[PDB]
Amino acid sequence: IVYKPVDLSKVTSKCGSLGNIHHKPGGGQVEVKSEKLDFKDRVQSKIGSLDNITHVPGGGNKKIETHK
Amino acid sequence: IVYKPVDLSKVTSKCGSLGNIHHKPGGGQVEVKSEKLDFKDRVQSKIGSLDNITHVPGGGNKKIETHK
Amino acid sequence: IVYKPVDLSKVTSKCGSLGNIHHKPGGGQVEVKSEKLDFKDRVQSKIGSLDNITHVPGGGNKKIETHK
Amino acid sequence: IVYKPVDLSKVTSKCGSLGNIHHKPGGGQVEVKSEKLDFKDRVQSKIGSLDNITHVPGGGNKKIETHK
Amino acid sequence: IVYKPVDLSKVTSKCGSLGNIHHKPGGGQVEVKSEKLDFKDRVQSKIGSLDNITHVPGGGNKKIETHK
Amino acid sequence: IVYKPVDLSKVTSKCGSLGNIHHKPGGGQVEVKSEKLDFKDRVQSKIGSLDNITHVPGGGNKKIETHK
């Protein structure tokens, strides 16, 4: 079997300026009041007003390759 | 079997200026009351007003490659 | 079997300036009242107003390869 | 002129118990940007996340009298 | 002119117990950027996350009287 | 003119117990940037995370009188 794929591709971006960005995620109020819960198997729990992810990359380009 | 893929590819970015970025995530108020719980197998817990991730890379480009 | 993949690829970024970034995550108020909890196996717990991660690299580029 | 008003009145309270009070005023995030303001007359200014007044008196009764 | 007002009044309270009070005012985050302000007359300014007043008197009763 | 007001009034309190009071004012974070401010008359300024006043008197009663 011959497996010889060729990749000469390019991912490119030009940004003259990136900025004057104001990000103000709002919190909010959270309340949790459990009483008589029973767990017969494993548990994962998250509690919180704000979960925030912010990306401001100058590039931020993504290339994914997979061969099998 | 001959496995000989070729990769001459590129991921590239030009950013003339990255900046003037204001990021101000707000907290918020959290309460958790739990009383009479029972767990027969393992537990993971997170509690907290804010969980925050911020990326401001000058590049931030990603190339992911996998061969099997 | 012959395994000889060829990789001459590149990940690159040009950033003229990186800066004037103001990051101010707000705390928030957190409360946790447990009373009669019972755990028959291991527990992992995190409690806290703010969990914060911040990255401001001049590059921040990633190239990942896996071969099997 | 005769001024002889008579006051025999009473203000009274009975409290069997006062307590098990949980008061948790939330803060919040505040920002003030002023730029080119001009004040030709006097100024009073207050800036702050929380201004809180709390009264838990065992009595707390008030009587006000004025004669002219 | 005859001025002879008579005051035999009473302000009273009975409290069996005062207590088990939890007061936890949250701070909060405050920011003030001024740039080119001009004041031609006097200025009063207060800046601060928390301003708090708390009264837990066993009595706390008030009587105010004025004659003119 | 005859001025002879009569005051035999009373302010009183009975408190069986005063206590088990937990007061925890939170600080908070404060920032103040001024740049080119101009003041032509006097200035009063206060800057600080927490300003706190707490009163827990067994009595705390007040009687105020004014005559003119």
Curated annotation (Swiss-Prot), chains A, B, C, D, E, F:
N6-acetyllysine PTM positions: K4, K10, K14, K24, K36, K40, K62
Glycosylation sites: K40, K46, K62
Sequence positions bearing Phosphoserine: S17, S45, S49
Chain positions found as N6,N6-dimethyllysine: K4
Modification sites for Omega-N-methylarginine: R42
Sites of the Glycyl lysine isopeptide (Lys-Gly) (interchain with G-Cter in ubiquitin) crosslink: K4, K10, K14, K24, K36, K40, K46, K62, K68
Signal sequence, renumbered to the chain: none
Modification note: Phosphorylation at serine and threonine residues in S-P or T-P motifs by proline-directed protein kinases (PDPK1, CDK1, CDK5, GSK3, MAPK) (only 2-3 sites per protein in interphase, seven-fold increase in mitosis, and in the form associated with paired helical filaments (PHF-tau)), and at serine residues in K-X-G-S motifs by MAP/microtubule affinity-regulating kinase (MARK1, MARK2, MARK3 or MARK4), causing detachment from microtubules, and their disassembly. Phosphorylation decreases with age.
Compartments, record wording: Cytoplasm, Cytosol; Cell membrane; Cytoplasm, Cytoskeleton; Cell projection, Axon
Documented effect of changing S45L: In fatal respiratory hypoventilation; unusual apparent autosomal recessive inheritance; reduced binding to microtubules as well as increased fibrillization and aggregation
Tau/MAP repeat boundaries on the chain: 1-29, 30-61
Record site: Not glycated: K4, K10, K14, K24, K33, K36, K63, K68
Tissue occurrence: Expressed in neurons. Isoform PNS-tau is expressed in the peripheral nervous system while the others are expressed in the central nervous system.
Entry's disease: In Alzheimer disease, the neuronal cytoskeleton in the brain is progressively disrupted and replaced by tangles of paired helical filaments (PHF) and straight filaments, mainly composed of hyperphosphorylated forms of TAU (PHF-TAU or AD P-TAU). O-GlcNAcylation is greatly reduced in Alzheimer disease brain cerebral cortex leading to an increase in TAU/MAPT phosphorylations. Frontotemporal dementia 1: A form of dementia characterized by pathologic finding of frontotemporal lobar degeneration, presenile dementia with behavioral changes, deterioration of cognitive capacities and loss of memory. In some cases, parkinsonian symptoms are prominent. Neuropathological changes include frontotemporal atrophy often associated with atrophy of the basal ganglia, substantia nigra, amygdala. In most cases, protein tau deposits are found in glial cells and/or neurons.
Summary of the function given for this chain in its UniProt record: Promotes microtubule assembly and stability, and might be involved in the establishment and maintenance of neuronal polarity. The C-terminus binds axonal microtubules while the N-terminus binds neural plasma membrane components, suggesting that tau functions as a linker protein between both. Axonal polarity is predetermined by TAU/MAPT localization (in the neuronal cell) in the domain of the cell body defined by the centrosome. The short isoforms allow plasticity of the cytoskeleton whereas the longer isoforms may preferentially play a role in its stabilization.
Quaternary structure and interacting proteins, as annotated: Interacts with MARK1, MARK2, MARK3 and MARK4. Interacts with PSMC2 through SQSTM1. Interacts with SQSTM1 when polyubiquitinated. Interacts with FKBP4. Binds to CSNK1D. Interacts with SGK1. Interacts with PIN1. Interacts with LRRK2. Interacts with LRP1, leading to endocytosis; this interaction is reduced in the presence of LRPAP1/RAP.
Domain-level remarks: The tau/MAP repeat binds to tubulin. Type I isoforms contain 3 repeats while type II isoforms contain 4 repeats.
Name the UniProt record assigns to this protein: Microtubule-associated protein tau
Source organism per UniProt: Homo sapiens (Human)
Residues of the full protein shown: 625 to 692 of 758
